[PDB]
């Protein structure tokens, strides 16, 4: 919905070249991304939030994506520290999606967030059960 690349003190981006010709292009990014939620079993729910990664202009004829290191391409799920949730697992996916303008590469990062109920017993269950 809105993303940005950190700017301080310099544009947070890295370039490392190799004699190979291989380029390493790092960015520090914060995105706020859509995560449609099934709140039917709220607040005893869990949700599947994703980050869909794709190329904007270049088709599969020009670009391929792959998770570098397969299953081990993503790090830091352990570092996530949310008061309200906990990460039960995550998943990496590789797909080709087809639009009118052609077929594009996509990678899909997914989390499964299990909601902690502590807040809701304090605020809504106890008041209800005590008021009963």
């Amino acid at each position: 919905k809105k993303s940005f690349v950190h700017g301080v003190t310099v544009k947070n981006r890295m370039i490392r070249l190799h004699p190979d010709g291989t380029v390493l292009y790092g960015l520090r990014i914060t995105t706020t991304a859509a995560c449609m939620m099934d709140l039917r079993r709220y607040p005893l729910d869990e949700q599947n939030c994703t980050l869909e990664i794709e190329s904007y202009g270049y088709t599969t004829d020009d670009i391929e994506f792959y998770w570098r290191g397969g299953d081990k391409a993503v790090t830091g799920v352990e570092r996530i520290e949310l008061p309200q949730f906990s990460i039960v697992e995550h998943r990496l996916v590789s797909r080709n999606v087809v639009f009118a303008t052609g077929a594009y590469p996509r990678l899909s990062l997914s989390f499964r967030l299990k909601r902690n109920i502590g807040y809701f017993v304090i605020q809504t269950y106890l008041p209800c059960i005590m008021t009963v």
Partner: nanobody, 123 residues
């Protein structure tokens, strides 16, 4: 995952009508859009139409436009396909498919993750 199963396919006479059903089970929320495809003996798999999670918005192929209607009933986890004024051109194996939330265009079958083993319609 999701599991789809069809029914209602059979022999019909031209100008006739028929109602196909597709009952779904499992994570139907993660795959909101449902689509109908048909596969003639010789020809390639063709897009028939599709319907949204809310059930409000639909979309049909030109050939099938005005003669077919797709409806949803999330109460029964089922989408319906009413085919009226049927032609011999409509003869095919009719498939039911479910598409992921961000899976690109409706028309292309690649994008759909889950299918049901289709039911035959002959006219």
């Amino acid at each position: 995952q999701v599991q789809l199963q069809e029914s209602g396919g059979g022999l019909v006479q031209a100008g006739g009508s028929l109602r196909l059903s597709c009952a779904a089970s499992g994570h139907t929320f993660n795959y909101p859009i449902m689509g109908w495809f048909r596969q003639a003996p010789g020809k390639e798999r063709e897009f028939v139409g599709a319907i949204s999670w809310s059930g409000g918005s639909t979309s049909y192929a030109d050939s099938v436009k005005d003669r077919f209607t797709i409806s949803r009933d999330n109460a029964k986890n089922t989408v319906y396909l009413e085919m009226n004024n049927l032609k011999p051109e409509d003869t095919a194996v009719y498939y039911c498919a479910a598409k992921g939330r961000y899976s690109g265009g409706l028309y292309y079958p690649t994008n759909y993750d889950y299918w049901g083993q289709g039911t035959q319609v002959t006219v």
